[PDB]
Every structure is written in structure tokens, then in C-alpha cells.
Amino acid sequence: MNLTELKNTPVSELITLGENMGLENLARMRKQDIIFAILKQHAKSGEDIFGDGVLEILQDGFGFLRSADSSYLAGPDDIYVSPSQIRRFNLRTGDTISGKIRPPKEGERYFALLKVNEVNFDKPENARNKILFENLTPLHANSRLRMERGNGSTEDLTARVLDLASLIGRGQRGLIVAPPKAGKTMLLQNIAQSIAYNHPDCVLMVLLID
Amino acid sequence: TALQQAFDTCQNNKAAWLQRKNELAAAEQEYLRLLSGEGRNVSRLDELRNIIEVRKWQVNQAAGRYIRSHEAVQHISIRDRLNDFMQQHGTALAAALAPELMGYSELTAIARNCAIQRATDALREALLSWLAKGEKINYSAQDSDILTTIGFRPDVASVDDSREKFTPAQNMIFSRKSAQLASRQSV
Numbered sequence A: 001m002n003l004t005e006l007k008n009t010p011v012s013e014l015i016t017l018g019e020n021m022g023l024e025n026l027a028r029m030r031k032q033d034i035i036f037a038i039l040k041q042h043a044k045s046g047e048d049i050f051g052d053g054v055l056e057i058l059q060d061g062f063g064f065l066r067s068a069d070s071s072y073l074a075g076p077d078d079i080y081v082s083p084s085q086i087r088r089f090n091l092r093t094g095d096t097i098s099g100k101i102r103p104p105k106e107g108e109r110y111f112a113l114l115k116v117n118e119v120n121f122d123k124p125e126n127a128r129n130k131i132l133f134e135n136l137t138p139l140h141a142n143s144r145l146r147m148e149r150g151n152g153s154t155e156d157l158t159a160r161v162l163d164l165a166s167l168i169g170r171g172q173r174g175l176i177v178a179p180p181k182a183g184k185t186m187l188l189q190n191i192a193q194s195i196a197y198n199h200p201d202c203v204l205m206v207l208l209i210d
Numbered sequence B: 001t002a003l004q005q006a007f008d009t010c011q012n013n014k015a016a017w018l019q020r021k022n023e024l025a026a027a028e029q030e031y032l033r034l035l036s037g038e039g040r041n042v043s044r045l046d047e048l049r050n051i052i053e054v055r056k057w058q059v060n061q062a063a064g065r066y067i068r069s070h071e072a073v074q075h076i077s078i079r080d081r082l083n084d085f086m087q088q089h090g091t092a093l094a095a096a097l098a099p100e101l102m103g104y105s106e107l108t109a110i111a112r113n114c115a116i117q118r119a120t121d122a123l124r125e126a127l128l129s130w131l132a133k134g135e136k137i138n139y140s141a142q143d144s145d146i147l148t149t150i151g152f153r154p155d156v157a158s159v160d161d162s163r164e165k166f167t168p169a170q171n172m173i174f175s176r177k178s179a180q181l182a183s184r185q186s187v
């Protein structure tokens, strides 16, 4: 079973699954605590349990592994990562790690990982021999990122005006200088929808602050 | 041996232009095939279009170079044939042009130029009269093969491809895009 599969489930499932596994009062506490309790209960049975997420390196190799759907929130369900396998696999911050996870021992309250079977959606040996980002030589934008959806949507006029106004391509560095109450949120929403529709290959990330 | 150099330079230019037209046609055909497909492939189609104009510009450049080299080799052969025909029959020629071509060694610039102009247009009436009576002009025997493989005129598929009149700005923009395309193809 997948920890990510648990985290993608809604909150009410704690009644359906947590109570069915013998837990007593998972109704009243924070969701990550419910996830921790259910996955501890399942781990006590002994079946193999999967895990995955984005790696974080602390100031002293006290590595952690967070989940994307939880907005990388520091919670009990975070996966511990000792410096030993960090050195062995030459890992660093931002690495997507997937594989086995281990139930915590005495004195530990975080689920460590037994062995990784996927790094950055690739084999660990293929991920190890990859050069650093900053060593890559930049260039100007070459491939055009057309925002015209082409589905004839009633809101597609925004994307069309965007295409006529400012061309967007791979590798640009863009700014949207707007006042409050101007339409930034749904302009970015239309941009994201057009990117998801026209260009399913490129990885799309949206980041929201305060 | 300069005529042979011009000849095989023109042959190389023609081969290069044919090759350029080859990948241009291939790119156009595959772009049409992808457009006919059900998949969207927006970036695929956009960069394929860009490749299409890059290949079109390369074809234009190759055709222009081929036409220029063909004209150059024709001019070189004309100069050589007319020069040694001078070396053959120039005594009789200048005898026919005697009443105004004398004194050229010491005449003034204006007099020399006007005498040359009179000689030129007189040759014009003579030549147009010979073309008017109308025999079939035959190629020079010494260079007949070299001047007949290149053809009387450059191929029409090259002439119709040299009417775009690209501006210099577009010229170096397309050169930069072609260099970037070659670099991407190498990778």
C-alpha cells in the first residue's frame, strides 16, 4: 500500500478504514496523526508498505522526506532519511525518492526508508551520474509555448489575447505587473489550463504564497 | 583551369540546392502528415513550422548561390572565347573599326570613351542583323560539354525561388536560426 494513496483519500475515510483496523478514537485529531496511526497499525501486521516524496536536507544531514499534496508540511508522516544513504546515493534537496519504508524503532518517531527503488522517476544509478543544474549553459527561448487552447472555450479569449500580447516560450523569465483586483488569479488559472491542455508533456507547478 | 573550377563549383552549388530542396520537401511532407493526425502536438507543429521557414531560407540561399555561380562560369567562358577570337581576327576587326579606333593610345578620356561607345553600338547593329537573318547558333567546340551540362539558362525551379527579396535584418535572423537549428540537430 502507498502512503501517497492514503494522503490522497479524503478525511472521512478515517471512520471507514481507521476504525475497521481496530483504532479507537481517530475521529478527533489532525489528519497527519490519523495517517500516522493507520500506517503504524498496518505496519504492525507486517506487510510491505511503500513510500515516496520530495527530499529535504537539514543542516547536519538529518534528512527528511515530505509529501507534495500536504504542501511539504512538517508532519509526523514525514519519512526519515539518515546521512548514510544520502552519501551512498549522492542525494540532495529536491530529489524525488520512492521505495520501501521502515517502521520506527524505539527512540524514533519517524518512518525511515529501507531501500529506494526510484529516484527522480529513474533508476538510482542513472540519477547518480547527472550533472548539476548550474553547470548547464543557458540560452534564449527557442520552443514556443502557444497558449491558444483551440477548443473554442468561452474563456479562451484571455489565452488568445495573451498570445497576441506577449509570446511565451520554454525557458522565459516572466513577470505579471498588475494592481490588486485586476485578474491575476484567473489569468494564471487560464495559463495553467492552457499549459495542461496544449502541452501535457511539460511538468506544470503552481506555487502560492500567503 | 579557372573555367573548370567555376564549372565544378556550379555543379556543387546545384547539388547542394537539390539537397536543400530535398529536406525542405521532406519536412513539409512530415509536417502535413502530423497536421493530418488526431494528436494536437502544438509545440511539435510550431517548431516544425519554424523548421519549415529555416529550410525555405536555406533553399533560397542555395538557389541564389547556384544562379550566381552559373552566371559567373558563363561570363568566364564568354570572356575566354571572345578573347581568343580577338587574338584570331582582331586585325580585320580593327580594320573594320579603323575610322574611329585610331589614336586610342594618346586620345583624351572623353574622346576615347565616345569612340568606344560608337564601336559598341555599331557592333550592336551588326550583331542584331546577324541574329535577324537567323541561323542556329552553335556552342563553342572547345568547351561545348562544360557549357552544355550547365545548361543555356539556370533551371526554372531555381529562378522562381529567388523572388522573395529578403531584408538584411531577416537575413541574419534566419542565419542565426539556421545555426541554432543545426546545433539542435547535432544534439
Ligand SMILES: Nc1ncnc2c1ncn2[C@@H]1O[C@H](COP(=O)(O)OP(=O)(O)OP(O)(O)=S)[C@@H](O)[C@H]1O
Pocket (backbone or CB within 6 Å): A155, A158, A180, A181, A182, A183, A184, A185, A186, A187
Ligand atoms: N476573463 C474574465 N472573465 C470574467 N470575469 C473576469 C475575468 N477576469 C477577471 N474577471 C473578474 O474580475 C475580478 C478578478 O478577480 P481575481 O482574479 O480573483 O482578482 P485577483 O487578480 O486574484 O486579485 P486579488 O487576489 O483580489 S488582490 C473578478 O470579479 C472576476 O469576476
Ligand SMILES: [Mg+2]
Pocket (backbone or CB within 6 Å): A184, A185
Ligand atoms: Mg488573487
